[PDB]
Design a protein around this ligand. Structure first.
Ligand SMILES: [Mn+2]
Length: 279
């Protein structure tokens, strides 16, 4: 009597992938629809993506319209349970552009929020695989504990840059939750990823705001263009920080190979970017 196989949980992108894989341990086999630095807001699902979902015992997604392409994707697969890892989180509405004041989906950029992400991942696993409950709870318990610990570090990290200098300018406004948590003023080229290609007025606005605040370093993300941000960089003298990570982790090489890494790093390169470097 063979013990049989392990459940297949599918997730929309690489960040959620690392989160779930940390609550599943070796009990479940986790897979992610998208591969590394890919625009996840409007990714087009290949046939393989469709077939996977069909042969997956559970599909976990962010919700809050993060993966605009989900509703459709899930539409063409029979009864494969689906749960939104975002349930419980009180959203921050979008500022402008299309999706005017709809929910900002980037809630996982808030360690405080990441905790409810992990509770829901946990709950779905005990129902999906009741036998391995113990493990999932032991995993989540350990995982939750690290979130809290890094949360302390994040807060103790950003409070360095004085209150009236805590300006986090970026490409997409994905760091809104991280900003609210650690009292920062956000400055972005566009609210959320959409029709996009942004506009010269959006970059124009970013151009003045940086000046009306003397932000020494400005960043962008590893999933969107940097052609727009750099302009504001070499036309405002602000130092162009590298890429911050939100909608996708990185490789085994490079930084941000794990979500927890993602938090420590983003904030770490943010804190010292707002410290010196005006001229
Ligand atoms: Mn995004």
């Amino acid at each position: 009597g063979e013990t049989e196989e392990k459940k297949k949980v599918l997730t929309t992108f690489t960040v959620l992938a690392d989160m779930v894989q940390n609550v599943a341990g070796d009990k479940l086999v986790v897979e992610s629809i998208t591969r590394i630095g890919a625009e996840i807001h409007g990714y087009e699902p290949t046939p393989s993506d469709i077939v996977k979902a069909q042969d997956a015992d559970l599909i976990l997604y962010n919700g809050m319209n993060l993966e605009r392409w989900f509703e459709q994707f899930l539409g063409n697969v029979k009864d494969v349970p689906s749960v939104v890892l975002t349930e419980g989180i009180e959203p921050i509405p979008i500022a402008d552009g299309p999706y005017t004041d709809k929910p900002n989906p980037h809630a996982w950029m808030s360690p405080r929020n990441a905790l409810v992400y992990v509770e829901n991942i946990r709950q779905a696993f005990v129902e999906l695989d009741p036998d391995n409950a113990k493990y999932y709870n032991a995993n989540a318990a350990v995982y939750s504990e690290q979130l809290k610990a890094i949360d302390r570090q994040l807060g103790a990290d950003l409070e360095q840059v004085p209150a009236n200098q805590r300006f986090l300018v970026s490409c997409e406004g994905a760091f809104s939750y991280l900003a609210r948590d650690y009292g920062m003023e956000e400055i972005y080229m566009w609210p959320i990823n959409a029709e996009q290609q942004f506009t010269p007025k959006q970059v124009q606005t970013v151009i003045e705001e940086v000046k009306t605040n003397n932000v020494p370093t400005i960043f962008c993300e590893s999933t969107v263009s940097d052609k727009g941000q750099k302009q504001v960089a070499q036309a405002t003298g602000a130092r162009f920080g590298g890429n911050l990570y939100v909608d996708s982790l990185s490789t085994e090489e490079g930084p941000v190979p794990t979500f927890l890494d993602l938090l420590e790093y983003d904030a770490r390169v943010i804190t010292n970017g707002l410290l010196a470097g005006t001229n």
